[PDB]
Design a binder for this molecule. Sequence first.
Ligand SMILES: Cc1ncc(Cn2c(C)c(CCOP(=O)(O)OP(=O)(O)O)sc2=O)c(N)n1
Ligand SMILES: Cc1ncc(Cn2c(C)c(CCOP(=O)(O)OP(=O)(O)O)sc2=O)c(N)n1
Ligand SMILES: Cc1ncc(Cn2c(C)c(CCOP(=O)(O)OP(=O)(O)O)sc2=O)c(N)n1
Ligand SMILES: [Ca+2]
Ligand SMILES: [Ca+2]
Ligand SMILES: [Ca+2]
Lengths: 522, 522, 522
Amino acid sequence: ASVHGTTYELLRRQGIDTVFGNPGSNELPFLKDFPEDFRYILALQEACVVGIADGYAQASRKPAFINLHSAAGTGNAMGALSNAWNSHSPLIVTAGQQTRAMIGVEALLTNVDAANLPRPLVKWSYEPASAAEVPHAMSRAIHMASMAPQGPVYLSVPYDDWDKDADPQSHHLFDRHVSSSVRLNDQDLDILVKALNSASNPAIVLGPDVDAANANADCVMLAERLKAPVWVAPSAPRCPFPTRHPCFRGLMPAGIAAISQLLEGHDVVLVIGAPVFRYTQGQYLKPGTRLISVTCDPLEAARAPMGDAIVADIGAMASALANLVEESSRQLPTAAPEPAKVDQDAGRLHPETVFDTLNDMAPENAIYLNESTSTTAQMWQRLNMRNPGSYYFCAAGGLGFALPAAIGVQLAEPERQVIAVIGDGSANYSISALWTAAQYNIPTIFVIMNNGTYGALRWFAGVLEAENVPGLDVPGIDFRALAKGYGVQALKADNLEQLKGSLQEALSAKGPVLIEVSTVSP
Amino acid sequence: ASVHGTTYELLRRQGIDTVFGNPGSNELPFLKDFPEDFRYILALQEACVVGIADGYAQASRKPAFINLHSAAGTGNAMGALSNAWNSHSPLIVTAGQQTRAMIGVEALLTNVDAANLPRPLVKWSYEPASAAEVPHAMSRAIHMASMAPQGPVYLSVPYDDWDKDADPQSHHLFDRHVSSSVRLNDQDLDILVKALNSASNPAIVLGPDVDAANANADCVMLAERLKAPVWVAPSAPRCPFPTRHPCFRGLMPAGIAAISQLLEGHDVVLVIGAPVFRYTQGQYLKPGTRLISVTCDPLEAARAPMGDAIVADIGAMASALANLVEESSRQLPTAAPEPAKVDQDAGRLHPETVFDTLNDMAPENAIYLNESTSTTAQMWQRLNMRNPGSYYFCAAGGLGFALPAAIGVQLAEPERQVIAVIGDGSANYSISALWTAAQYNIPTIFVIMNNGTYGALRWFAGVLEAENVPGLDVPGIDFRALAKGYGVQALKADNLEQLKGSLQEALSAKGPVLIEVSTVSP
Amino acid sequence: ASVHGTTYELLRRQGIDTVFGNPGSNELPFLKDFPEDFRYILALQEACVVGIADGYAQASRKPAFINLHSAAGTGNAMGALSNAWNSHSPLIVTAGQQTRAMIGVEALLTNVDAANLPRPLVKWSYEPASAAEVPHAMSRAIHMASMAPQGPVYLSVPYDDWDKDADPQSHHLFDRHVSSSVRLNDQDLDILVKALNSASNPAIVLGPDVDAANANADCVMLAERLKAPVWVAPSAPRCPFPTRHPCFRGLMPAGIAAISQLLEGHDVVLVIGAPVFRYTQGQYLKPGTRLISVTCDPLEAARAPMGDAIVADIGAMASALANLVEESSRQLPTAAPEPAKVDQDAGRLHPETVFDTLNDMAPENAIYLNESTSTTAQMWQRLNMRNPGSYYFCAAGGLGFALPAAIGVQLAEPERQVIAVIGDGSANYSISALWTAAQYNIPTIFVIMNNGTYGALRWFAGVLEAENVPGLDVPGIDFRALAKGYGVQALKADNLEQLKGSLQEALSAKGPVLIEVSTVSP
Ligand SMILES: Cc1ncc(Cn2c(C)c(CCOP(=O)(O)OP(=O)(O)O)sc2=O)c(N)n1
Ligand SMILES: Cc1ncc(Cn2c(C)c(CCOP(=O)(O)OP(=O)(O)O)sc2=O)c(N)n1
Ligand SMILES: Cc1ncc(Cn2c(C)c(CCOP(=O)(O)OP(=O)(O)O)sc2=O)c(N)n1
Ligand SMILES: [Ca+2]
Ligand SMILES: [Ca+2]
Ligand SMILES: [Ca+2]
């Protein structure tokens, strides 16, 4: 067998059948004779390629496979890898290298010091020392991406390796199953469970790794048994809990002081599947509050400024806890009141109005993506997200995620309507991703919130009283024309009447639709 | 509180009371006002400093703390860190940096690009962005070193940080407890246990992480219940099993083909706490053999060329398995026959004779270190090692480990006699370590096997029929004089009579003793 | 031709005939069939191997070739590479890697992420992607080490590459000549020369790159024509000027303020072949002082906090300047007065007495090395060093340089008596280097200054008024016994009478000699 043949067999045997890519000459010997059972998803730029794969991986809860071209293609994707690093997305990033004989002289298209290029944003980065090693190296990549804590990995492969003979002993790689489905030992788990049972006023904080693990339902049970309020850790990349459940208390403020005050009065705070904490912009905890973190990531456990930590699989830990804890006789928290309806005239739309309307009209199993940076708090308060996998927001804050990721999520969840709510500033970073939705008829709905400015930046500047900051406005962009350019149906909504009409049309459409919404300026 | 004060409090609260070091000006603001409850172990070279700390950490099964001087001191230790990386030794390596104001201009003693220096041989490498961050960074270092898979870590700290005010919120770091004591979920563990119960001819292979976890006794029980033969994974850095137990089958050959043949006929092979495999110098497995690996290290799981893998804590997994598996009705393996006594005249000593004599004379709870590279196989067959923590051998093959490490082990185990058996070639790499044993009266016994050559290299050259290789001989070294130079009592053994007499004296001595033994030349 | 054959031909064609090394299995296919015209210098530890090569390279003013074993051997040398980085020493460091087929599984002796190991202390670090590339990669290494600014480089080569067929087109590598012998363009050089001619009170500061370039004589002429005082840049790794020349003003203090005061009153300060500046422990310049730096290193030019800079070859620039500048009518500086003779009784020796005696007795073309850290200022004032290449001191401050480097210098300069003056603390770092001097009969003289303490550290602690610092004393070392251990003749000097007698004997000896001198304690 050839290295090409053996590698594609390893991929399929390991559950991979889709390649997200933008092609180049170094990759042609890999892409040629493309297997009939494989499917190739083309995107026009590497940030888009990885963003689509990322959404696909996160929604599917399985590794996604990416193929990029050398240094320039890999480099074009590194902003996307920054998000993937912080969302623990299992991405197998492969890039083609020059033929081995051409690397030394540094011929055009040579990826110099390839493995160092993607660092520090990868779990593992490698270029094999010989063609026959490629399947073993690919096996390593697959498992490194997939083991907890999941994350992106990088494999650089010389052009000429693919046609070479593979080692027959490579067949041992095909069916390797590696498990990181582990939880705290019985003795220590019993101690933890007793600590929870003994809490007088426990609180639960949940992060993106709960949703990644599909531990949402186990967390609901856990919160019901402990009769404990539940918050989502700040800077949330996913939604780990039903947002209308009686126990749900919403998205935490990202401030250090704000969080300590929020947790004050709670004797035991159980954090699950979140960093402690993804702060932004001053006590860590107030006296009386004990914090215990369950995390799949040693790096998270190491850097928490407070609390005990357990490094384990979130799915295994959530299931164990939900089933071991006693049913508290305490009264179950009462549901948070519905958010107020904001005054809206017949002019430009307040973001609050857009989210209310989306909540009114979207299916109950819709999936939302957020890259409307100044409206996040309102979005969380106004969308009823009952199901797991219902929310994605760039984990590292890297704009250009939501647009391509929404396409990947929709590809992964063909039966759930994806609605990406993206600001006019953010829409540009990965605008070319629209083409992929059009070409493959992936029916994502893109809601562009157009207020003509980088709103979140103006706000921040405003709080700091920072004057004379350049570059905060982005006037003069026609999103209907951009959508048309890439073959996506386009609508505009200058008022509520038009918003409702556009959504009605979009929600009945057979392909992707972009709606440009005129929103109020800050 | 000062950063100095807060950092030493973090250390002691985290169980650290000993600093292994070689001092420099960048480190003086850290070392000054040295706490009365702390103890400072000086070594004359950085390879020795880290080697001593490594032995200390491995024997104590807890992190060791190291303080080195800038780039030159850190660099002098990186060969030692290569061993530590492969033995999963929890070493907290700190190095002093220039004052922040002097880094830019690159004043003398500046550690340029400090964090990159120790990579890739560390789990974590860091230089804090400000003085107040130092305790948090130290907290990160402590936990990164200690979490499974354990390993060395590096922290670079500017001179001037120590006297600065610490953040009062740093007190939250003091009592943080982080656990990686996890094992496979109940459901999947039950499946594994059924697979073991169902095996017709199971075999067990154990690596250094068993001994690190003190899982030895649980592994004995596991092997007795399964009635299974037990081997030690190749290139063994530690001894994970009693070498005279009926089930014990010895050290595996490091060859790929050799191991597949050894495992042939065994339907299920359970590997615990070892890489799969640390080969040297050709099927991975023969048909009929299924391999399952339990490892604390994702990197090990990823790179195994065959078998399933479970990434979990070795102590937790060994205990769970030993207690869950059924008692097989199969007949317990019978003990391997004692090794033959080799012909010995009244002249130079055959290594076989030295090990027999050591086994005859040493206490039953002796601890051995090996850096006699051409005699390893004989050592394993001839020393009865009943207890855990009884054997150490450089995990990466880096010579200069055993001599200092034997001092650290003896410091950690004051009641167990340490006997380091070290070749004449290997003895030189970290010769200056002798001084530390002398100065602190650490009563290690050093047995120098002197055959005047790099024997293992001559052998290897011989197998390859490689001719005209320079640099394989090391004549003209007087180890009694070197020992005298560093203040260690010294004896010579030119024959068996003298070997017995020297050992009798050494085993009754009140301080360190070096015995130079004249061994047969290859 | 084989890769082995082609590589050794490339080496010899490029002027390399000596390999400094400590061998291992990964290196045997390289070392076997060792060419008859090549010579192999064995050292017992890697810090010693590189230190010897470093001294050899610096004295010979040509690249030295090193061969080390994998990660552990490379790591053992990185402290030595820190010195080499700061002295711009052209060292070609090669290390053997596992066979290509064994790298992936990570067999014993695998150098993981090899190229990253030596960074950031190398100009260039590489592992070839195939056997046939090895000669081209070696060509790259040779030229990278040799081009200005010279420095160490690293090449990692898999075991199995050596026996493979070489590309016949590799013959084009053999006679490649690369030049960096460049200087400022005529127009700008004329401007510089006019600036020097126009100076009313010019000063010259010279660094190690002058001595490396053998630009010493041109600098003398330059200083005579400009009638300008000449200082040596602080933390001096070499001596760039005759120390008794009328213009010579000695070693600069390393303080920022100290240097600005020293240069005050000088309208133009010309720095040649030095970083600006290698400070330690506050105006950079005082008003009225203009600084112009000529440096072979862009990194030096970039990081100078003041002055203009020209990045050019020091030899070419010094020659051009010396020949272009006008002969100033100013009166030539008068020679600095001889240093005072310090009171000396019949007891322990004051360092001042040792240096006076050395100056009295040593040949006028002696070469000195310094690693007696508390006596540097006295050494500079008391040794008359008339010739180039007469002084070496660890460029990065990394102790363990002088002892092995003195052996390499003596090997490079067989007709010039090398005298290494090394403190009792420093002597231990690379003590095993003594063996190489003994084995190859390299007649270096080692003067051990024994005061029982890390004197420079006690002094520094004293200035900072830092109390309770551990680890500053090193009692109980017998240097005569250590020398005996490694086969070097040994003498002791407890007083002046014995010092003179020992030196007389050493200076008449036919082999290496170590003299242990009892010096006054701080
Ligand atoms: C790749 C990238 N570039 C720049 C930014 C900085 N940035 C920028 C440019 C923001 C404004 C986004 O504007 P928008 O129109 O998408 O949304 P709002 O008007 O609601 O803020 S939010 C923010 O963090 C970023 N986060 N990521
Ligand atoms: C730091 C380092 N340098 C070089 C080697 C290479 N090497 C060397 C030099 C060996 C010979 C050790 O000789 P010895 O006298 O200690 O023992 P034997 O004579 O029994 O082999 S074994 C081996 O792998 C190494 N492993 N580690
Ligand atoms: C490799 C390394 N380790 C530690 C130091 C720190 N250090 C040490 C340990 C010094 C004392 C050297 O003592 P000595 O006996 O050689 O000389 P003095 O007594 O004259 O200082 S000078 C100094 O910078 C260093 N520079 N390099
Ligand atoms: Ca906007
Ligand atoms: Ca030997
Ligand atoms: Ca001293």
